[PDB]
Structure formats: C-alpha cells, structure tokens
Amino acid sequence: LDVPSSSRYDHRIRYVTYNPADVVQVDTVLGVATHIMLEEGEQYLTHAFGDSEAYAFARKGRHIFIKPQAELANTNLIVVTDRRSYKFRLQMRNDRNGAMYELAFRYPDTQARQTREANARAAVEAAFEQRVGAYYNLKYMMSGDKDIAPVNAWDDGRFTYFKFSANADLPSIYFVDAEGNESLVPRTTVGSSNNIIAVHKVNPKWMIRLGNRALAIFNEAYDPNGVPNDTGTASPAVRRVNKGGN
Amino acid sequence: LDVPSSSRYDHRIRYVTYNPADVVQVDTVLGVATHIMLEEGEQYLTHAFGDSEAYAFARKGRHIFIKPQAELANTNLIVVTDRRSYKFRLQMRNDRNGAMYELAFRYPDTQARQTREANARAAVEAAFEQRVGAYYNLKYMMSGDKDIAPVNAWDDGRFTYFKFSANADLPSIYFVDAEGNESLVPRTTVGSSNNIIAVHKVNPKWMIRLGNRALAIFNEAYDPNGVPNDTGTASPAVRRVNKGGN
Amino acid sequence: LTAGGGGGGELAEKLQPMRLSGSSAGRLGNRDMLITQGTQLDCVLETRLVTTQPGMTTCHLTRDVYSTSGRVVLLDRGSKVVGFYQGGLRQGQARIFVQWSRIETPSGVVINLDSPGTGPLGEAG
Amino acid sequence: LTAGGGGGGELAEKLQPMRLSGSSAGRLGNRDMLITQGTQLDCVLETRLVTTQPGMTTCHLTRDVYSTSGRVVLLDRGSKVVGFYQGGLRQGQARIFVQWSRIETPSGVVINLDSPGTGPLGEAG
Amino acid sequence: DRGSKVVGFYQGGLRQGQARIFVQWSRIETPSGVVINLDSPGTGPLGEAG
Amino acid sequence: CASAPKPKQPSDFNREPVNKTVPVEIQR
C-alpha cells in the first residue's frame, strides 16, 4: 500500500512512484476534487469502481477528476490503460482534513532514461569538440585557372578541405577517377565564415569549376591505405550504437 | 499554500508567482466577481469543482470567472490547460471584507525573456550606427560612356558604393567575371537622398549600363583576401544567433 | 464535477468601360529579416543537366545573400538548393524552365521558396 | 446462464494580378540523423541494364554517406540498393529513368527512399 | 524613391508576326520599405505597349 | 556527327603548391 508523499510547500500535493504490484491509498476528504495524471500520451482503455455512485468520474486525455458524492465512500478503482493497471484504494476521510489536490506518478525507469541521453549528448558534443590526435597533409599542387584559387587545401585522412578567401565565390568541387572522367561527391560547408568547403573523400586529383573556368588540384601525397573508420562517425572518439534493436 | 500579495494601490487586486507544486489560497466573498487570467494563448482543457453548484464558472478563452452562488461554498478548483495546472482553495469569507477582483500569476520565465529582448534590440539599433573601423579604398578607374559616371566610388571590403549626382538617372550595375561575361549582383539603394547605390560584393571589374550607353568600372586595388565574415551581419559588432533552436 | 435601349450592339459593347480597382500602400514587417520578391540568388550549378528524362537539379549559392535592408546575412554562401524540371522541350525552344523547391543552409536553416531558374543574366529558364 | 466593369476583357484578363503566397523559414530537427534533399548517393551498378522488358536493378554504394552535419556515418559503404524502371524508350531519347526503392545497410538499417537514378555526373536518367 | 525595385512577370510567348511581348508588373519596393502592388502594363522607351 | 561539347580542360603547365602559407585552423 503506497502512501503518497507531500511536497514541501503544501501537503495537498503528493507524489508517488509507480509499482506494478502495489495499490495506492487515497484518503478522499469530502468536498474536494482529486486530480490523477497519467503518463504523457497514456491511452485510456477502461476503469472500474467499487461504487459507481460513491464517486464522480471525469476524464480528458490523461487527466482524471474524482470526488466523493455519497456517504461511506470506501471502494477501489482499477483504471487500466494500454501500458499498465493502476489500483487505488479510495477511503473517504471523515474530518475533511489532509486533502490531496493532485497526485503524481513519477516513473523511475523513464526518469533514468531521460537523465541518460542528456549526459550522453553532452559527452558526444564534448568529444566532437575535442578534435585531437590527427595528422594533416599539405602536399597539394594546383594547375590552370588561378582566379578560383583556394587559399589553402589539406586533408585529415578522412576529409579533404578547401579554404577560400572572403572575396571569392564558392565554386563546385568535382571528383576525378584514374581515367579522367569527373563525378559527384557530397560536400558540406564548415567554418566561422563558411569559407571552408569539405568533401567526403581523399583522392589524388580534384577538379574545381565555375562557369567556363576550370581548375585542377593534384593530391601529391595520396595515401591508398588511409585510416579505417571503425567508430562509425567523423571522429574516432564517438561510436554509433543500434537503438533499433530487433 | 500560496497566499497572494495585495497591490499597494488596492487590496482587491492580488499577485502571486505561479508555482506548480503548491495551491493558491483564494478567499472569495459574497456578491463580488473574481477574474482569473491565464498565460496568453492558453488553451483550456478542463476544470473541476469541489461543488458544481456552489460556484458559477464562466470562461472566454483565457479569462475565468468564479462567483459564489450558495452558502458554505468552501471547495477547490482544478483548471488544467495545455501549458500547466492550477489549484485554488476557494474559501468563502463571511464578513463581506477582503474581497478580490483579479488574480494574475507570474510566469517568471516568459516575462524574463521578454525583458531581455528589448535590451538586445535597443543595443543593436545603436551598434549598427556605430560603424567605425573599416578600410576605405578609393583607387577606381572608369572608361566608356562617361556621361553616366558616378561622382564618387569606393569600397569598404564588403560592400562597394557608387554615388550618383542628384541630376542623373540611377543606372543598372552589373558584375563581371574573368572572361568578360556579365552577371547580376544584388543591389541596395542607400544614403540620405538615395544618391548612393550599394552592391553586395567587391570585384575587379564593374560594368555600368543604362539604356544603350555603357560605362565600365575597373578596380585597381582588388584584394583577394578581404575581411572575413565571422559575425554574420553587415557589422563586426552585431552577431546572428540561431534562435530557432529545435 | 462540472456544471455543464441597347441597340447598335457593336459600338455599344466597344464603349463598355473598363474599370481598374484602386490600390493602397502597405509597409513591410521588419526589413532586416526579409527577402523581397525579385532579389537575386546566384548559385553555381552542380549537376550536369540533360532534358531527355525528367529529373532534379542541385546548385550551391556563391554569395552571402543579405537582407532587403542589406544588413543581415540570411543565406550563407555554400548553401544548397534543390530544384527540378519536367516535360522536356518543344521544337525551336532553346531553354528549359526549372523550379527550385527548397534551399538549405550550412547552419540548418531551411526556407521553402518556389522560384524560377534563370541563366547568368536572369532570362527565363 | 449469462447476463445480457468586366469590359476590355482581353486587356483586363491579361492584367489580372498574380499573387504568390509568402513563405516562412523552418528549421531542421536533428542534423545528425537526417539526410537533406539533394545529397548524392554515389553507388555502383551491379546488374547489366537492358530496357527491352521492365525489370529491376541493383547497385551498391562505394562511399560512406555522412550526415548533413558531416559527423555521422548513416549508410555503410557496401549498402545494397534496389531499383526499377519501366515503359522503355520513346524514339530519339537516349536515357531511361530509374527509381530507387530501398537501401539496406549491412547492419540491418532499412529506409525507403524514392529518388531518381542519375548518370555519373548527376544527369537525369 | 528613385532606385526602387519593381518585379513583374509575363507569359505565353508570341505568335507569328508579332514583335513585342506584353509584360505586366506586380509590385514595387521602395528603399525605405513601402510596398504597393500596382498592376500596370509595361512599355518601351516611348510608351508603346509591351 | 556532332555531340555535346566537353567542359574546358584546364591547362597542365602552371603547377604550383596551393598552400603558400600554413592554414590556420590546424592551429598552425
């Protein structure tokens, strides 16, 4: 028999932690409405009263209001939703003291969850901003149009970066195979001033185009080996785990 | 219990800061009106009474109205809405004194946010006008149909300005690429008398056209590096934040 | 819980007047954070384009597209724009009309514009 | 056992206004678990393609598909993509249009993407 | 104010023999933010239609 | 007999290193 525990401002607000194998004691005092609040998005199925007429019931979504309406209101409520089955022991109090106005069901499992992913997200963001333990290549040569010339180009072994000054237009970046044909690669833009365009590969030969001006970039320190990406992310500090289960 | 404080102006108007974990001690009297104001845009879900008949309930949106209509009307009001829940201990005062007319709760977060935004706007609407610490170029050649020629042209490193006299038409200004192709550039008219046309770029060669007379502008001190746009605005003193959050 | 004559029809109708309604000037909401019709987006095309089958396009902006007041950067350079066409061509036509459904920014701002695509100088298609 | 006026029609009609609805900027929910429109999935074809009869295709990716934030692998290289085509060609055409149905990461991720197949350079069909 | 911007559309193309195109205009934007949506046909340098 | 023009193929003579200076975000 779980006893609701009151808040430290008033005794009329009480909290109770759920239990599948225990019923809830509610001492209903005369003349008050009691608010029972379900889980967010709890789907209502059915109730059951020890006396339909000793108590007045009204529901909206996950909200319940109960009120004494007959003498000697001492019965039980078994309200069942999709997820569980609440059990309330409705005992009417005689001296109309010690009312409850809302009852709360904190679920320790759900609170434990909510705490977890917040800490996890903080850790993930911290790990990403750590960005330590990498090598950087700068053996890059360029040929052709220099008016689309990036100011710096490099690679961290997984991504290739180009940097353009403030006054130039950001061109399109193209991937060259060994044969000489071009093709598409996904690109993303990063930086304080969006002046770095990053592509998702390291390749010996890059081609840059803008209208009818074409520029070629040679990666002259190509690493066929590269660093394998076991962690499943852009940084070796974070894994990628399967939530979906099944 | 949360017992409000009367206004220094009048005792009939009382304020108390909303706290979900407490009840509101409301002392109604006979023959007076009580006004309850929700937070703006609060969608009413349901309410409940310790007595459906002791008081009378009137709602127009977020305005709630409760009057006694029977003696010994000491019950509780639980109006739950989308945003929060309210608990009033309707205790009737028999001496026809200490009447209350309105209760409006304090939502500290909302008012707190609203206080700061005005400060931000006021500061911004002066930071823009500050506008100090920029380098002005003045090396500009012109050639072509000289009748259209602006009286003064210069650039700040981010925007290029053209000033036309009051007696001249405002021509169309075009951005030139390397090969000589002409392309559009967004433009904005500024200045006290709309005699200054500003373009959103800096470039070596500008082409000015009007009707069928065309003038060419060559920049003689074009800087590839420029000044980076790390603030995200026209100013180095105003930042742009992603308030959309999500 | 809860308590509760007209003859000469030809010159008649050619004299039928034509009335154009009035107009009133409005004002914009906040110029620092709006982009008006007719403002120029200058993106560089990524995907090569063939009109034999209906497909989609893709282009990246090349300039910070400032606000109508010319004070706030509302679309960062390198933003990414998706657009499509259809229907193919008809004889003699040497242009195709392409429509850009959605832009997407580096910082995650997504605004849904439905604008025509133009050549380097604004001509249709 | 159990219980229980209108005149000047042509000059008027050609002067009817075209009023275009405004648009508002939303925002993406999570830029790490989301692939924006227009991102390039660069797979390699498995089966030889003949358009004489309507059938299905199959291709496998060749690069890890990173999230738009560029921080998460969302589709492991070697993921399997099924697609199909139908109807054949009309005279003079030189490309057939294929729709991709589904992608499968070896780790059991299945997502239904419907997007148009493209050539090496993103050209339609 | 001079230097304001005006946006407008056209459609339909031409037919044989015609040598001008009828372009309508829809909106005008002042520098200081005044918008009024005049709907008036556009004219060449000497007012001829289209 | 006539087909799509190939895009401009850049000249292969002016081959220079791209990084005249060490890039900054490397913290170098």
Residue numbers in the entry:
A (entry chain B), B (entry chain E): 21 to 266
C (entry chain A), D (entry chain n): 150 to 153, 177 to 297
E (entry chain D): 248 to 297
F (entry chain C): 17 to 44
What did the study's authors say about this model?
Further analysis employing 3D classification reveals a degree of heterogeneity in the positioning of the two extra TrwF/VirB9NTD-TrwE/VirB10NTD sub-complexes within the I-layer. We obtained three distinct OMCC structures, each characterised by a unique arrangement of the two extra sub-complexes in the I-layer. Aligning the structures of these three I-layer conformations using the O-layer as the reference underscores how the variability in the positions of the two extra I-layer complexes impacts the overall I-layer structure. In both, this shift changes in magnitude, being maximal in the superposition involving the second extra sub-complex (that in orange in Fig. 2C i.e. complex 10 in the A versus B superposition and complex 11 in the A versus C superposition) and, intriguingly, being minimal in the complexes opposite (complex 2 in the A versus B superposition and complex 3 in the A versus C superposition). Thus, the insertion of extra complexes occurs at various positions in the I-layer, resulting in structural adjustments that propagate over the entire I-layer.
Previously, we solved the cryo-electron microscopy (cryo-EM) structure of a conjugative T4SS. In this article, based on additional data, we present a more complete T4SS cryo-EM structure than that published earlier.
